């Protein structure tokens, strides 16, 4: 019974292994996997075997940005059936705790989440999942778009928490994959202009393709100088800044750059301690907000994709079959591409 | 000193008259008028000499959707100067009352407002206005777009109060000018799909041009049937309904149509008493909200226009010089067009 | 095996019957019932065998405002154990649907809810319930206070949706049980003054005891006159009105009474069609909101009770043992009391 | 013409000087000052002649927490008249800028603000002020309560921005005057429990008198230990933390202490750079918000005082006549009291 699976055993130890075919409980579905995007999260576990307090204490299956086809459903599942194409939302609450009740299930301490240990991910042939967290895709939304909902959702959640809306000018720090999905989400939510900063001329070219209104190549500027160049291009201070690099200097830039009364959202992972002009922000009522994944983004993402109101397709720079997963991870690490997409279906390998 | 002015003396009594050149106080500007759109508000005062409790007790200058050029500024005015092209926000608070302080100046009982009596409007050659409520237009935004900010703002304010955002499906009742600006605002704010209903095949054709995702021609349907047809086209109940007709049956339709937990916003003017399945809405937590003009929409409208993120141009169906204002009002009443635009500048009559 | 249960068989057909001892599933608990309040909801099913579209098609156990003691827990239950005193939140979602995910589980169409048919209630000796919807009571919170969380929650949810906060003046229409819990919730949320209207001098005396800052006895006033008398007592128009009678004239009064920009919340059940100065509200941006039960109120209610920050005790006017349930229902119908409280525990019959 | 005035000429240079009687413009009033509280702001200008970028470049009158009696009004003033007792809101916008329009006038860069240079304050006999920012006091609200609205408003604004509401448990860092007003505001807004931390047994005794549910004396605890002790007393992590010391370790404590999804509001002034577990907060969606004074707090503060729903009286520990202002400032600096209150009226020196 063939179920090739990509597994991290520890720092730098990545292996392709055969796994049993999972058996779906009464409210789960079994999925034949199709398209699985990888991101810095996966690469980080690969390299270091941990992300902060999340530690790989036993071999873990990677992969958490995914779509596939229902092949089997549990006795209690009614909204999905074999043949259904679905996007997988990787975080599924185990308990109806208070976070779940108030509608912030992302914060639930007992949540299951693909490829954050000890929870196995979906970079494999066959995978089972809580049925309520698999979302039927319409026929004009590709498997890859379905997989891309996950990174898009990072941007949606951050932009919601920032309060991005009609006419706002927005600064996005970083033209990596995180920055690009926040650019996409901001424009989708009505931002008039997004400026994107980055050190790389290459990444910024790609941010342009994706829809950045302005690009700004940073070199040795101070945070105040960055904020200043940003304001100069926009004609004003941006109501919202989304910081996607985790780099302290970029966080400071965001604080100086953001319009008074505005919001800076931290999406990139920084060091355990950050040094910031906390006062500068606080005295200007610039709020500083973080994000932890996302909640309630799949249906609205699917709605925007299905209506062609957002375009995530240019994000995919590489495709590899599942058998070439180790190479794909090398490609993702070298960071020349954006989204490296893994194709798990021997039957079909198109988008 | 030539300052032709369109004046309503009472029910059906419209005249073009010469007025003195207004003198701007210390915080006012004098404007050479350029483009002035007319709407049902103006036509209503023309026909009936009142809109509810607002009564024309002495001759009134009409016109409240306008743009022009600063020719003179007061001693305290610093952000505008002669030569500046500006959009005029017709509601300017006279006092720093509590509504103003909390940021809801539209509700200020002593607000000045063009062409709502006893306040004279701007359908004339020369007009003076509170400087803080004239907004500089950038050079890639036409005078007509500047004039159109006013009707667009009706839609922006309504859609904000409805909470329209990323991915929502929205029902707009009415394909008249009010309905079309709400269609535009909803899409600009991130709605995935807007369906527009109306009795007229002609108006709906125009709603399509403007960007309606679906159109629905109504005839003798009951409110439940309308709600049903709407749901059928969208694939779900719309999170937001914007009611733009003021027609009781359309209001009821909105109540049946709107998703539970959603919002129905009333923009059209109905009868003094309305009969509604108030309970049906209330038990489904469908909120019912109204609007009174707008507040804080000019800068964000200008930002969206300047970035080409919204297109109001297709709204203009007719242009008349100021001298043909009576004809223009006839055209606006017969309701075959959408926006009838009046050109007040003898120097320039382009958009 | 003794499990006396109060059952409605149809219009005016109420019986006390022995039921099997329910068996808790893996995530349920079995409760030895202690205190069960009754309300117009129960009385309504008794009298008419329906509330609108909710119809008693087979015998139903009544009772939905309750507390008791855990005697048995399911294999998956960890936060509760035998001996735990708990308040029962009667609405427990069956499915993780979209309403649940976004934190509005009250709107879930498949929710289980005590004594709304076809779901049996908890007016009995032994009752089983979803464990996540039973809330441990601290030792300084009585069983009756625990039972009273349910009616209090009606007020909490309504006042939240109204946006009651520090310093607001609030109008509550109706001094029945619904009105009194909204008075309590408004004061708890920081309202400076609550005025309560009613036809009964008796009910208003009780509203005073409970904490009403002003009482207003209505007789033949018109809605405009009511609004006027209200404003006169408060010194201003109330930012919030909570309408608790369902009476059309009282709804109209609320519309005239509420401050511009304010909110009217409809808690009382009215007729299928209501006639209202919808326009008057809409043009003053008075929002009209309804409620459907409550969501996420139990923990904050328990917190306020435990800190003695709210006092629901004066609401209980009568106590009857379970065996005298038919009499208790007669008492509740005659409407001279407020909260009629039923004592189900043969071991203990104190508050 | 006697108008004694307290003036800072520079670091440690405080003088009492006679000033001209100010002349109120058309929308100003002249006030006979009555009660003026002092705070760290005043003391800071006294000691250092600056607070960050706000620098005393010429002699400045101090005092910004004040009340008095209207003696003269401008030609345009209608809501106030000689004899009116009023509370003075020290920040009065000069321009109708965008911050003002959207209801955040506190952020207006051109705002006038008592005793923040170059704007003279109200520690004097006679003072003139923008009429719209003087608020009539009812007869059951004392002059001192009127003066205390200003510090209370600091707490109101911070607690609003934190989202303090019914049932929340709140941590307040610091039992100085800033901490105590935030304790008062939180309880007024419906917090079930407030715990207050501080190094001083004396300050905490006073926080108890004022209404703190718990007090915690800190010594050499680490931020994690503080957060831990806080959680232990409350029985849970507080939904809101208000940090009132500006001390980096206390800010870190707030981050560890605050419930996930919660809010930490920074009210105390810290160093230009702060080192914080920014990541810890961000990954738990603990928002970090600052405050800059307040907006729209006077009317709701007056409403709460007039209804006896909040008690600021215990804050006043000392009273000095204006002639003993230098001593009063010494008393305020030695920090043994809380609110030092200055009495400016030779006619009356009661509360
Ligand atoms: Zn990822
Ligand atoms: Zn108009
Ligand atoms: Zn009930
Ligand atoms: Zn102060």
């Amino acid at each position: 019974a063939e179920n090739l699976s990509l597994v991290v055993h520890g720092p730098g130890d990545l292996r392709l292994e055969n796994y049993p075919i999972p058996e779906p409980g009464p409210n789960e579905v079994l999925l034949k996997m199709h398209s699985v995007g990888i991101c810095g999260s996966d690469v980080h576990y690969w390299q270091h075997g941990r992300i902060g307090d999340f530690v790989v204490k036993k071999p873990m299956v990677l992969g958490h940005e995914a779509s596939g086809t229902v092949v089997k459903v549990g006795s209690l599942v009614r909204h999905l059936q074999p043949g259904d194409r679905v996007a997988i939302q990787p975080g599924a609450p185990r308990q109806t705790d208070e976070f779940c009740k108030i509608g912030r299930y992302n914060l639930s301490p007992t949540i299951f989440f693909c490829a954050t240990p000890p929870d196995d991910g979906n970079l494999c042939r066959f995978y089972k999942h809580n049925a309520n967290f698999c979302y039927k895709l319409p026929d004009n939304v590709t498997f890859e778009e379905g997989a891309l909902i996950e990174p898009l959702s990072v941007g949606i959640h951050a932009c919601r928490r920032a309060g991005v809306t009609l006419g706002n000018k927005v600064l996005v720090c970083g033209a990596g994959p995180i920055g690009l999905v926040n650019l996409l989400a901001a424009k989708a939510m009505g931002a008039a202009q997004v400026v994107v900063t980055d050190l790389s001329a290459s990444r910024l070219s790609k941010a342009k393709e994706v829809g950045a209104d302005f690009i700004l190549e940073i070199s040795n500027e101070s945070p105040e100088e960055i904020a200043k160049k940003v304001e100069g291009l926009l004609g004003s201070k941006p109501e919202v800044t989304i910081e996607c690099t985790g780099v302290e200097t970029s966080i400071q830039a965001g604080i100086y750059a953001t319009h008074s009364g505005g919001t800076l959202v931290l999406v990139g992972l920084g060091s355990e301690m950050t040094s910031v002009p906390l006062v500068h922000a606080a005295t200007r009522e610039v709020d500083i907000k973080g994000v932890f994944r996302y909640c309630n983004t799949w249906p609205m993402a699917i709605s925007m994709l299905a209506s062609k109101s957002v375009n995530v397709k240019p994000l995919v720079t590489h495709r590899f079959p599942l058998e070439k997963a180790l190479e794909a991870f090398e490609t993702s690490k070298k960071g020349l591409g954006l989204k490296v997409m893994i194709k798990c279906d021997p039957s079909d390998q198109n988008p």
Side-chain angles (χ1 to χ4, degrees), chain A:
Chain A
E2 206 264 352
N3 181 21
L4 185 64
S5 301
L6 184 69
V7 188
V8 55
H9 290 240
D13 189 0
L14 216 56
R15 318 178 178 174
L16 282 168
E17 301 182 1
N18 211 38
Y19 266 49
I21 310 301
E23 181 72 352
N27 198 81
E28 290 174 341
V29 300
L30 181 64
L31 306 153
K32 177 178 179 66
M33 298 303 299
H34 190 283
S35 301
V36 176
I38 58 201
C39 85
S41 163
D42 302 305
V43 170
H44 202 279
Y45 284 109
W46 171 31
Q47 293 301 298
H48 316 281
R50 75 189 284 129
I51 300 186
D53 290 323
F54 297 123
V55 184
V56 175
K57 303 175 191 290
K58 71 164 189 174
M60 188 185 62
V61 182
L62 292 161
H64 63 271
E65 312 174 359
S67 68
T69 306
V70 172
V71 288
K72 201 171 172 165
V73 313
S75 58
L76 293 188
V77 171
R78 64 182 194 175
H79 62 296
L80 299 168
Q81 61 176 22
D84 282 346
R85 303 162 67 244
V86 307
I88 300 164
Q89 178 168 9
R94 288 181 175 99
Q95 309 180 354
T96 311
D97 64 13
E98 291 305 318
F99 292 107
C100 289
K101 295 183 194 169
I102 67 168
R104 302 185 73 174
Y105 61 82
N106 60 305
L107 298 179
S108 181
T110 58
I111 194 171
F112 169 101
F113 192 100
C114 299
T116 293
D119 299 326
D120 278 340
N122 45 31
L123 196 38
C124 55
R125 307 272 196 216
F126 295 102
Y127 174 74
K128 70 173 183 65
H129 204 68
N130 183 315
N132 300 118
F133 290 83
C134 299
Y135 299 81
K136 177 62 179 302
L137 296 169
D139 284 331
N140 68 331
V141 172
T142 71
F143 281 112
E144 287 183 8
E145 288 174 297
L148 287 168
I149 295 178
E150 201 282 342
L152 182 59
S153 291
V154 173
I156 295 181
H157 186 66
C159 285
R160 285 171 167 184
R161 287 179 43 74
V164 177
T165 189
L166 192 156
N168 295 164
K169 298 152 149 48
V170 179
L171 163 64
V172 173
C173 297
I178 309 172
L180 303 183
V181 297
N182 278 277
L183 158 61
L184 293 172
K187 300 292 294 178
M189 281 166 54
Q193 277 157 352
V194 179
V195 53
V196 180
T197 61
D198 198 277
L199 291 170
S200 165
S202 163
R203 293 180 181 271
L204 293 171
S205 279
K206 192 69 177 180
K208 256 293 168 189
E209 183 187 347
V210 160
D213 296 287
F214 303 97
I215 47 177
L216 170 59
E217 187 174 17
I218 302 312
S219 58
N220 54 13
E221 288 88 356
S222 77
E224 291 91 342
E225 286 168 358
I226 298 182
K228 187 182 186 174
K229 296 166 97 87
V230 163
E231 178 167 5
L233 286 173
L234 292 172
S236 55
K237 289 203 175 60
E239 295 93 344
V240 168
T241 295
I242 314 289
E243 208 301 305
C244 299
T245 69
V247 170
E248 168 171 303
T249 46
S250 187
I251 296 162
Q252 304 171 338
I255 296 184
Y256 298 114
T258 304
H259 197 273
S260 295
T263 301
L264 165 67
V265 178
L266 306 180
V267 184
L269 260 190
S271 41
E272 289 295 63
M273 289 292 115
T274 320
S275 175
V276 284
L278 197 41
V279 166
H280 190 259
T283 139
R284 298 175 58 237
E285 298 181 358
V286 181
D287 295 339
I288 297 169
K289 294 191 179 182
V291 288
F292 187 67
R293 293 142 178 188
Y294 32 65
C295 57
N296 299 304
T297 57
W298 260 249
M300 289 309 94
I302 282 154
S303 171
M304 287 301 271
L305 287 164
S307 62
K308 305 298 161 177
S309 292
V310 74
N311 186 18
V312 293
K313 296 180 182 188
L315 297 176
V316 176
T317 57
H318 298 85
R319 298 182 178 75
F320 294 93
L322 181 60
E323 288 84 348
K324 293 188 171 184
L326 260 73
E327 182 180 348
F329 269 68
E330 289 297 356
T331 299
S332 190
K333 190 182 86 183
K334 295 181 195 308
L336 270 43
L338 291 175
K339 211 67 206 174
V340 165
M341 187 59 67
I342 305 195
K343 314 303 288 186
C344 305
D345 187 338
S347 314
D348 169 38
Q349 301 94 32
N350 296 118

